[PDB]
Amino acid sequence: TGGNLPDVASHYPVAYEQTLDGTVGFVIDEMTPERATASVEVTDTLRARWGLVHGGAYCALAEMLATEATVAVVHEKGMMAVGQSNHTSFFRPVKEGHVRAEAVRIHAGSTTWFWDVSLRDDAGRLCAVSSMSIAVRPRRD
Amino acid sequence: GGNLPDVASHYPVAYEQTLDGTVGFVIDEMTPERATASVEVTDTLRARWGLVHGGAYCALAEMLATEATVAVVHEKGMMAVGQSNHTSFFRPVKEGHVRAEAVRIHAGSTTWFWDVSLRDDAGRLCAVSSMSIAVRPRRD
Amino acid sequence: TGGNLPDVASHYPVAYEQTLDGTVGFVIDEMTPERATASVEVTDTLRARWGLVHGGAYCALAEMLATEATVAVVHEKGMMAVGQSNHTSFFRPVKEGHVRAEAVRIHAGSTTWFWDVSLRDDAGRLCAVSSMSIAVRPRRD
Amino acid sequence: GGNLPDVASHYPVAYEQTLDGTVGFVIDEMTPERATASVEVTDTLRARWGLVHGGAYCALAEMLATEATVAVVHEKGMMAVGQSNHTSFFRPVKEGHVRAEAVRIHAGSTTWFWDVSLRDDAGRLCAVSSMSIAVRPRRD
């Protein structure tokens, strides 16, 4: 699939290249029910005007990763998954290189899954973390 | 230039090349205690599922809260940067616009806090973001 | 009811005076579907060893207020309400006096209600805020 | 004295009179990067509905994260205080104990961040708390 997102359906409303994720270059590497990773090359498109990766870019990468990792498991069960809360804290800026995210599932309830995402720079330094709660609900179609 | 606060003669990244300029964030009003901004929904703002990306609301909030702090503190020798962003999502947005309004609720010496509300074209509260902005002496 | 909590049932598992809320002295003042207030006199029981109100005391007052305000509306509809996320940020310490909390409902969905709680000191200063998400689910009994 | 870090000769409030001593919080292990604490469930820890109070998990996390920062920074002339506490609740606890484990994930000059996991007697993760601790020069 585009950006290596889970392929859970034959078509999607928006093609990868046209989505925010495609635009900024997010790509999923590993994907398992309890852990997933993704990364993105830093370019100006990922930065704010001050020159460092935009705080929203870390939120977004976390959001896509944690939601899609949930989607990978729940879609075939007839459920949809969507972000309900995204709490990202920023410890160190990233000027360039990549941002690498690792999502670890820490709770999988019937209505809410929760994932902790660490976002690191190319030296391995923890630049941000995001705690994501993902709502899971039966699909409407 | 997205109408961001004109506080410096040079910025490392031009608006149009930033995440903000790429998705189309524009600031409407800005005062020390309250600031607004908006964006048209386009595919660039969406996830593959066709609804606005959760990261878009976070990003809009982050830019608005931070730049509304920059607008005040930059001329004081300070830099402003997001330290925590908590966004909660109540209703999706499929198309139209997202409109953010940031209300300053605390301005301490090292931290400012803004509540951001993100509404759809019908005025419905689709998401909120509680933004903590660190304020530190600018580096030489 | 004890602490003026909503009286939605004829009995409760734990008497007010014996609960955490009773122990520290939380009391609800106003209670409406979209807004509720409560307050507590600061005594050592509310403080940490350093002498200021414990961060947990603000979390707890917010939690009781936002959950009970939801309970007041949903109990008779056959639902239970319980805290799902409590995010409290601390802006100014409180040494003594009272802490006064005001809870404003900002979203009432079918599964989650969300309340913003402001916690102020006797001078009116905003000492903390809490964003609370309250899960609402059908009661089991 | 709940076995809190013995960093000062006098504290404004004795353990037994604090919120912590009233509900019975006790610290078990403490190192610069990791600390544990626990509490017996009693009615004092509960809401009227019979389950542990959400505020109890928050309080336990707040004390543990803060005091684990105090333990390091106090002798350096710094004070430590909670700046943000985000607790998410996954499973209730009706009785037994709550056991908290705090893991330091960032120690910056002005902010330390701890992840706290709160488990029941069966080891099940009942709640988590992401704690931000401000660190500032102690006032004279």
Ligand SMILES: CC(C)(COP(=O)(O)OP(=O)(O)OC[C@H]1O[C@@H](n2cnc3c(N)ncnc32)[C@H](O)[C@@H]1OP(=O)(O)O)[C@@H](O)C(=O)NCCC(=O)NCCSCC(=O)c1ccc(O)cc1
């Ligand atoms: C929030 C939620 C209900 C979402 O759960 P879900 O996805 O609908 O359901 P899920 O199948 O994962 O259930 C997980 C566990 O949650 C509990 N639960 C879920 N639904 C229900 C329900 N309808 N009724 C009772 N318990 C339920 C139950 O313990 C369940 O385990 P099991 O009995 O089914 O094995 C669940 O994750 C949960 O129970 N979290 C813990 C909530 C909690 O304990 N919050 C802290 C207390 S906040 C409240 C408070 O402090 C307060 C203070 C003063 C006061 O006056 C009033 C309140």
Ligand SMILES: CC(C)(COP(=O)(O)OP(=O)(O)OC[C@H]1O[C@@H](n2cnc3c(N)ncnc32)[C@H](O)[C@@H]1OP(=O)(O)O)[C@@H](O)C(=O)NCCC(=O)NCCSCC(=O)c1ccc(O)cc1
């Ligand atoms: C977090 C922070 C220190 C950031 O402040 P800042 O930007 O450096 O400084 P700012 O100049 O805006 O100061 C605002 C107010 O903060 C307080 N403050 C700031 N810095 C200091 C300091 N170095 N020393 C003492 N107070 C300070 C002070 O009240 C100040 O007002 P003023 O005296 O200057 O008029 C300030 O917003 C604050 O104090 N927030 C409240 C923190 C709080 O009360 N947290 C809840 C307690 S969490 C701890 C806890 O529960 C615990 C439990 C058990 C246990 O064993 C240990 C701890």
Ligand SMILES: CC(C)(COP(=O)(O)OP(=O)(O)OC[C@H]1O[C@@H](n2cnc3c(N)ncnc32)[C@H](O)[C@@H]1OP(=O)(O)O)[C@@H](O)C(=O)NCCC(=O)NCCSCC(=O)c1ccc(O)cc1
């Ligand atoms: C989280 C939740 C589903 C909880 O809702 P609830 O309490 O179950 O249901 P409630 O009756 O209040 O419904 C409120 C509205 O939510 C929506 N909704 C609720 N349930 C469903 C459902 N089963 N299917 C579709 N929409 C639903 C719907 O819009 C509803 O309005 P209506 O059509 O019924 O008038 C709802 O509050 C909500 O939809 N919040 C907004 C979620 C959101 O848009 N999150 C941000 C996007 S996060 C995802 C993301 O960024 C991503 C990025 C990349 C990628 O590859 C994948 C994902």
Ligand SMILES: CC(C)(COP(=O)(O)OP(=O)(O)OC[C@H]1O[C@@H](n2cnc3c(N)ncnc32)[C@H](O)[C@@H]1OP(=O)(O)O)[C@@H](O)C(=O)NCCC(=O)NCCSCC(=O)c1ccc(O)cc1
């Ligand atoms: C929040 C804080 C400044 C607190 O740091 P602190 O405790 O004062 O200082 P600490 O000594 O631990 O510094 C750690 C690192 O922070 C950075 N930093 C700290 N203070 C400064 C400063 N005054 N100037 C520049 N960098 C600083 C610096 O990278 C430092 O490393 P080093 O150069 O000292 O090796 C630091 O943790 C931090 O920088 N976190 C990352 C902040 C971040 O990158 N947030 C996301 C961007 S949010 C903004 C945004 O998206 C935006 C979008 C659009 C727009 O138009 C405007 C903004």
